[PDB]
């Protein structure tokens, strides 16, 4: 997101605005205002690694922008928007991730490595890789009888089509010692 | 199938610099997804 302080009516601020957005969900609901439009309208731009070197990013658009004049004891503890030079803002951090990690629920609550594990195993799992398996003659392939979409979810999943082609089941799990088996 | 389509190979030599997760990697490559041992960090995912 480009944040250029072009706000003659306030501080520095994101190019894109609630209008741009409802104007997009407009087209979402029609299934004219593409991604390419957000781009040509210089609201969002592609910055590589090299060019990243010379800019300053705001994690959350909100949080890291309006001024400051209590805090939730349960939530985590965020640093701050101590800056004004903000040239860009991250669409959402959840995007540093990759398809793999993107299906891991609450990965912001796991010991780092544990995330790299499930990141490899999900590729050892079973489900429904395509809906036309009935017609494919691939050597070896497994389809899970009754796949249930997960109860826990990720806004990322939505684009990975996970809910339409899951890879597991919601099992009623009890954590306890029993027989000892 | 998706994840394989976004896979990166980074040929080796004979260290640990390339195997490690760099800062510039933020936003570009995944911080958690990489093969264990062997070619760890040598194979990355966008």
């Amino acid at each position: 997101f480009i944040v250029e302080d072009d706000e003659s009516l306030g501080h520095k601020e994101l190019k894109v605005r609630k209008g741009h957005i409802a104007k997009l969900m407009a087209t979402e609901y029609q299934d004219e205002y593409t991604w390419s439009s957000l781009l040509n309208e210089g609201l969002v731009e592609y910055i590589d690694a090299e060019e990243e070197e010379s800019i300053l990013i705001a994690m959350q658009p909100e949080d890291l922008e309006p001024a400051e004049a209590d805090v939730d004891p349960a939530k985590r503890i965020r640093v701050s928007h101590h800056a004004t030079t903000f040239t860009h803002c991250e669409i959402h951090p959840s995007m540093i991730l990759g398809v793999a990690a993107s299906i891991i629920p609450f990965p912001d609550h796991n010991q780092s490595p544990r995330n790299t594990y499930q990141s490899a195993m999900g590729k050892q799992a079973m489900g429904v890789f395509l809906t036309n398996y009935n017609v494919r003659m691939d050597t070896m392939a497994n389809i899970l009888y009754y796949p249930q979409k997960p109860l826990g979810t990720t806004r990322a999943m939505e684009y990975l089509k996970f809910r339409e082609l899951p890879a597991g089941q919601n099992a009623i799990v009890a954590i306890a010692c029993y027989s000892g088996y | 199938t998706l994840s394989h389509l976004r896979r990166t190979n980074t040929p080796i030599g004979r260290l640990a610099k390339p195997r490690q997760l760099h800062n510039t990697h933020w936003g570009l490559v995944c911080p958690a997804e990489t093969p264990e041992g062997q070619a760890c960090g040598l194979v990355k995912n966008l």
Binding site: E13, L14, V16, R17, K18, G19, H20, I21, A22, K23, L24, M25, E28, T34, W35, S36, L38, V44, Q60, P61, E62, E65, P66, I91, H92, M95, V99, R155, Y159, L160 | L2, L5, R6, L46
Partner: peptide, 30 residues
């Protein structure tokens, strides 16, 4: 007020737009 700010939730709508056009495998294609 087609010119007000934008909170968290909003960003998603943009992200949706992204994939609508590019697609998870874009790179390999282009």
């Amino acid at each position: 007020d087609e010119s007000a700010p934008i909170t968290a939730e909003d960003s998603w709508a943009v992200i949706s737009a992204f994939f609508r056009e590019k697609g998870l495998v874009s790179q390999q294609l282009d």
